[model samples]
Target: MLKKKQLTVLDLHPGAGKTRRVLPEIVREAIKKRLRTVILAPTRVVAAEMEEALRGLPVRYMTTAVNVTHSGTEIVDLMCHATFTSRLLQPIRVPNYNLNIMDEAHFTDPSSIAARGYISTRVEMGEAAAIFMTATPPGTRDAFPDSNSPIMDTEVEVPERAWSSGFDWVTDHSGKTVWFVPSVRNGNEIAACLTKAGKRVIQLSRKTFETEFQKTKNQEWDFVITTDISEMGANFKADRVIDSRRCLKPVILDGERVILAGPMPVTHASAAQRRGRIGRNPNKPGDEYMYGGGCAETDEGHAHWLEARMLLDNIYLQDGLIASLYRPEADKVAAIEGEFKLRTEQRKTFVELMKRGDLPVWLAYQVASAGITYTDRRWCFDGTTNNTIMEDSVPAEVWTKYGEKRVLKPRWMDARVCSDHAALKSFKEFAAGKR
Candidate 1:
């Protein structure tokens, strides 16, 4: 059995065929132990791929269970059945099952829904065991070295293992041509420039997924460019990856190519994925780069500062953070109540009522616990303060007390109350929302 806080680093190859070899081993081990395992992944595509690979093996399920999860169609079917049952029974019946394989185990930390789901599942069901699989765990990124440093410190020596265990792709990517473009036209322009330079021109555009985004395997692309649609879902094998827009960090999924790009802000979870891209192809050199051209100069810095300032000004109008946090959970409310020395039951009515009405979790939690109630319509930290009675802020002590538990970040609560876009737009949007 994998111990708590233990890192089982599986160094596998980059190709889908090679990666398939590792899945059966994991599934066999779990089945041998009669462990009800859960597989978790960063994206449905990865999850579905792993699930399909595992299903090909002669593994037995507890219930003649030839069914696989993580496909969009499977998810839809499950939800539809649940909805049908709820309509018939008029009662809540959350599907409970054992065995979840967390594909992207690096994100098994707080502030992530995947982490929350894993934690909540174990807490709710004692029999469930979650097997976390990630080529690279957190804290080994070129940037954000401190991410998983605390855990690494307890297990291995730094510098030798943490810094030197993996190849430094940034070093390899030095002097490489990098192009940053905002739109498809701009991308073509950059491609033309590189082609004129007599460099190996690779154009990555949305066309990469035109036909075989689903079926193709063990394929290689010289240049790969894709929209946000293909960002976190499918794992494509490429020589290297350059984000034209640089809006999202690139994920290295065990490929032979080195990444040449700009200083994209990568979260701890994403940094691991980027590193995993390299070293997938054995004996081949891989690298990743992020170029910053002295933007620290006063003029450039000031320009960026002003742009960020302006972005913040319209954040509420353009963002969806506020709506996401409108309702919270019991653990969250308990954290708030613990700080205020209030009873947990105080908001039970609101929470239970919201649940009865099928309100969103964020909205329900907001109304029951943190919402300001007046004689008018209740307001839960949205703009317009529509029908708000209590405008008083929670005491700083309330935040400080709960801050130790860290159930939720104070920034999230503050944003819900202050910004129009306090709620997270998607479950994935919760990655860096508010706090």
Candidate 2:
């Protein structure tokens, strides 16, 4: 459908041939037709899985600035979405490919209207066509929109499984279990609690997830505790899955540790991914349990992304002028759309990081979201724009150097950013040196 049309949203089931069969065949057809194909994976791990699936095909897997030497025989460039989005807005070549495959396209920055415009602009230019393969169905006016640009859904009847409480999942399951705890404290605390109850538990650090998990399987460990890494479709063979959430993330305030930030709410996608860890084997369905608000019940004074969202909303509604002041231009909504929608959806709470005195986070956010880093713009960080110093600006002169991965990527701890007593014991083992 996409070969003839400018855009197509392919809605398929999670295990339905998306990467296993469909994508490989698509790459083969692209090669046969001499179509320059660029497949964008939502995360680097997913892109790595793309490399695994596309093995033996003429494909080049690329990430942030670390170029894989193409064998002169390659046609498809399977890349991380960040690499694609970052380079596109660096004011370089846009999506001009003959075939652009955006795998899991729903996993996107909903607020990056500039990148969205660049992509929407590409389809209009008529050189590139897109095959947006997503597990979730796309709506008419969603993150990826339109129908001159159309949506094609493939229906699959997925089985329904019963849900139990997390506290209950611990006592009931016998074979194996995987619990997705979003905070470091919970992983440790829960695991520690389970261990004291005479349950075998392995709280996984990325450093130890693989080796530890393998040990669990071979030696018959009962419960494996980790975060979202397990949600990317790794077969854990657990008979039950627990989706636990702690409402607050830990932050140090004054001399005492306190709560200021937390994860976004327990989203449907998160619930779907977490529950998917079960029922990989035929005729075997497992249980799902979820509680906890994930974050605070309210976003009133929390110095996280919710706070940032409130700031944006206060700027956007009632008054539209100042909100529309420093945003990209769109031909349709044209004026005020970019002001509110153009900013990035920061899961890491970049503003809160700035408040916590993590200027590196601030600098990285500025580079990613601000136009001051781009060329032909006079809005220097702290320097002059026509020889006049801007008072609020701060001097920063370092475009993320090639292979310098500080800006686009995040450290593991920064990504989690949760506070719970169970989480701290886990993090202490980290920068303090661990296996």
Candidate 3:
């Protein structure tokens, strides 16, 4: 359908299966014409899922594994369905492809180098056509309304539901139940509580969620609790979805530890994404249960409760305006910005390190400012042979340089820069006390 179209955005609802149904045909035609097709997914799991879905098609397809080293040779020789994560796509210097389809394109920050490379492959250098598929298109009016990029959108009808509150609704429902928890740690805690209460529950994290999901996806379970990993693209057939209102927790943003005493309501967009997870089966009617109004008896608790109620009302009962419902208070935003801002003293020190050609130290400070870490040895950049205890291998000079002037950046860097910066930091930290 998007043969001649320049820029097309397909706003599909979760469980709509539009990609599952339509992509096969597109792939078949592309194969027959010997035109190469590249499909980009936000994460490895999504890329794996896409590869699985399109496996039945006769056209050649391959999912780029994170560990697998590749050249442009296989992509050209294959000339059919090529699936890749955004991370893997970054280092790939492929010059041409007939079609570039970005699954969950809303997650792609247009300013990022990966996104820019995708655009270069499709729009700038190559004659490839572009197709953006997403559940939410980010902006309301004029989504990607650039002069060169005139977008045509097709919105899929999402299943509607009756909304309620608490675990009470779960008692009245029949099929599988999914409870959205705030964090992985919290979900595990809740799973233990539910198990102790004589309910069969399973908690999933990013590490084991996909494996667990694949085994019991088609079968019904007593209860499955997970974090925001299931917030998008993942399909589930449930009669009810319980929003435990546990999505928010305490975190150290810049330096000070901030705690959210009550349920931190999600944006209208996220709520809609969660809502669409249920009632996917046309024969079954589903409902959403939002548990709230319960907080500790304190000033912070009471304030958070009020804010939660207001957000709930705005999202569920009113216009469902995310800006009105989810944006933090003006004062809080200002305070957060102030806290994360880089001090002049810190900047002076950073400039001195850069000017002195201390790349390791300069990069270490950037990584520290961004607050990123990786446990994997491969992700560590400190030129060390031992992957184990890599954090200890970072040079002492880097740490000393960082200690000289430690200040947070005004905002966190993009994922690409952050990853590169973190690698250097991890390497230096692991190589610490060494020359």
Candidate 4:
């Protein structure tokens, strides 16, 4: 299929051994055909892991490092088999490899620069066969251009589970366990609670977590506490995995921070991934426990939890992928379209100024509409005669001594909320449709 210029999207479940078994087989065939292949991962950790996984294979491969260009003589001598993070493709020139694989492709946000850069490279190298391997594709139509692209999936069985807010299950279990929390701060709090209960706990950080885990693999620890960093490729051999409910975060609606009450329910993919971490060791059939706000035991909790559960069940469990829930609300969609139009207009103005070779004055009309405040101030560009005095000017400066271009020198006070604040509020409400 790849040789036929087909774009393949593989929705392989976590711990299903796609990287170990499936990816290696594909790489072996690509090497036999002498096809130059580039595999892109979402993070450096996963990239390094892929390089290690392919170490014993007959193909010669090079993994990307920070600030190192792949076009160097050393890379050319290393057979041109490259594995690197997708972010590296943003600024550097891409080589036209015969095959390109994006591992954990769900992390590619359509609006992100890295994703745009990757799309550009793929378009430029039209003949290159591409493969997108992900657990959850973006829940948006933009991510899938060719709807005809063959999407293959291999389902993995979820472990037995019970919901709880405490560690009674862990007290009964004798083997290794992992408590996955939503945030680092929450993980530390949980760690302290477990420590108080006389359990040995190891708190993992993003930087040293992988190395620390390897070093302590042989030793016995009661629990390994971690944040979302371990959500992807990292695995731990454990008897039970504890996951906390996803909490509601502040949403910048028209720029003012507004948060919904209570914690948000866990998505089906996240629940499944955290559960898959355990039960890898066949000797112990692991179990997954989720902590909630007593949803199963209270009326108020059930009302809040039911909404999210129904959505998750219908979108993830029933439909098989969250992309099925990409249907946008009509009001929100209109608002988004309006926002896009405003940005497009602003960009056109900027481009027009740039084409005329003028130092464009930064306007904050949209920013003001978004409820952002700026105080009246004069922005001075060092060594430049373009010091235009204006009220509530956006802060900017230039440092020619250090050979730097014009930069923003932010001040605490910039713009004042004049009579326009009420008008902007009205406009926002009108755009969002009186709701």
Candidate 5:
């Protein structure tokens, strides 16, 4: 496909010989053409998978984003999205490469600032043929440079899944079940409740991901609660699956913590990915499966659907990647480029300028979040108020007289809201130096 198409979107199904067969063939073709290939993996597991797939080939593996010294077409440059995006923002002008392919591309998400940098890096490369390959596409046109290239997807009808919600699905099922939640905070909370009720539960969170994933094999467990960390390539099996994220979630609204009360919409491919976690145990034969998808069902679901839309719009409204939505998109890109240049030059008060009141509030806020000046990649807001370190909530805080829990930064700041051409980050990755 790359021999003819300049831009290709491969929506191949999982276990569809993408990494083992298709990817190696493409690299071989690139080798024949004497073109440089840079393959960006979304997670560490996929990065390792690429290493094994192309084991005998001359491949350069880069772990961190800080340094990438190799500049050659013959060696395949393999790195994660973090490293690639870090290099992209460093303003490294075109020096090499014909192919810039991303494995599991949907993980970067078209609605993210990294996605903009991904597109920008390719655009900057000029002749670099790009491939956004994933089983689950973001389901948006903003994913492509232009709609000229073909979007390739395997033609297969998804098996019907029965949807259930709450503890009923967990109680009724008698087999091992994998439960997917939205965040570490929620996972811990839910796991505690299940543990008390005599349900064997284990958690895979920021603190427990590596350790607990090991326990699932040796320890007796009924439920495994996890954030998006288990979404892809977490090689565990279960007989049933439950994703509690299909309900209302929290999000930042005008610097206030609020519930996005509606059905949390996810792509069908994403749903399939979660569902496949179950029935992976070959011994648990037959088609008997219970998969809980939707969370709530009522007129209130529609009423709250309006609420979720409003909350989603608020998150989407602020961001530099929202440029993709603008009429004269190039203009916004140029403006953001200016900001990037100044910051890269070690401009003092770059953070302050972003929060300036004189500039259009929307534009300034967008630049700040995009640049990670006052907010982290997860959109967790931070600031200094009155000579003191301040913690913020999507980035709001609510101190109550009734002694309710005070949340400085809400975990759902990384919610994947479905908005047209909006900048969003779905899963929060593990921080480098955090416990």
Candidate 6:
């Protein structure tokens, strides 16, 4: 029953007048329809910016309605933290008659907390229509069916590449820098070691966010060693990225370089955004350099970490488990051997437990292969009394012994649970009953 004219598309580059054109359109329509519109953004900063941009319009700033979910201070107005689980509980009291504008619509997945929250709200808000905006929408396999998907329509804009000239100049320099504390107490000691080695040494940390950023812009420093935040916001034109803090593998931004080093790490998202710093505008033909020393393992661990980081960065909205739980540690072929041994022992135990429960040979044999040997003792349930199963419930010994000899088929349980769009929409009618 919806009119095609109700939908509008605005595809434009960041800071390229998209907001200026679309904000007025949105405000006017909201006024005409007397609709309460919710705008969701990936970050608190982004949401606040958008809200401020729309402030002069006729639209109402409904504290009870127009709320920013991501901010710590602002979430109280929104009535729920940004997450799938939180939004699923239906924390907000506003009526579901309005419009939902999701900023980073590409992030509609389990790993993205913001995306999940948007989905949760969209389902509960019945009369609402969604206006999805994103630069990168997933292709066929990645996108769900229309019935379950939130996007109603899409428009795309591809910009032309800039004409190229070449590099202007290059310079080489060195100096001693004073790094702040909290990272290590012995800044002077560290400086002394690097200086003795004939290396340009410097120490930098939280000294002052504004002062440091301004100083970097005002003066030229040869080697700047600092946290990842230094590489964000405005661009830093560094020739070579020596990533001593391997946060996410070294990345080449606009041809400029980013190197990662250090221990623990920042999220893969932060790493990519930092990498966006290079080759964006002024810098071109950039290169990134990486160093794996100290805690950086030379084994497959480092390789696994790199692979996982790549997958996480590329598949921003997908589940993390797909790339093996983003596990930095490499899988041990030796562990497979040990696992085989353990599976063998587990089979034997299941057989014994089945015998005590008076289960027949066929079911016992079936249970062994399905890896359903373990039981919940508190529930007074064993293999015979309770049939709890999973994919890995099967044992190798059963397969080896049977060789297709056993008549009983192996039984495995599927535990996958997700809310389809239709199901979510229907939840509204039943939501009050649960209370």
| Ten contiguous residues with the weakest lDDT in model 3 | 142-151
Q: Write the per-residue lDDT of candidate 2 for residues 1-435, one digit (tens) a residue.
A: 446337676766555557777999988888989988888766555666677777779887777433356697777887765466445423356436778787765442322222233344455556567776755432221211221112222122211122234346346657776777655554776677677778888776533455665675577778888865554445565666556532233332431123435554434444445555554455553233333333222222222322222223322222332222111222212123333233444422333323332222223244335432222112222232332211125311223323221211112113222234333333222222231
- Clashes counted in candidate 6 amount to 22
> Which residues of candidate 3, in runs, are more than 4 Å off?
1-5, 43-45, 56-92, 108-127, 140-168, 171-174, 218-220, 245-263, 287-365, 368-435
Clash totals for all candidate models: 38, 8, 16, 4, 3, 22
Q: What lDDT does each candidate get?
A: 0.32, 0.47, 0.43, 0.42, 0.46, 0.33
Taking all chains together, the TM-score of candidate 3 against the true structure is 0.53
Report clash pairs, candidate 5. 111-424, 381-395, 393-396
Model 2 regions more than 4 Å off: 63-70, 89-95, 108-121, 137-169, 202-221, 233-235, 245-265, 283-435
lDDT of 5 by residue, 192-262 (tens): 76777678998875334556777888888888887655656565656556655343333335442233444
Candidate 6 TM-score versus the reference: 0.33
Q: Please, what is the TM-score per model? A: 0.41, 0.56, 0.53, 0.54, 0.58, 0.33
The best-first sequence of candidates by TM-score reads: 5, 2, 4, 3, 1, 6
**Residue ranges of candidate 4 with Cα displaced over 4 Å:** 58-91, 108-126, 138-167, 205-208, 215-218, 247-250, 255-263, 286-435
Indicate the residue-level lDDT of 44 in model 4.
53
lDDT of 5: 0.46
Against the true structure, candidate 5 reaches a TM-score of 0.58
Cα lDDT tens digits for candidate 3, 68-138: 33443433222211223122222345545566666665441211212423333345333557666666554
Which residue pairs clash in candidate 4? 374-414, 374-415, 375-414, 375-415
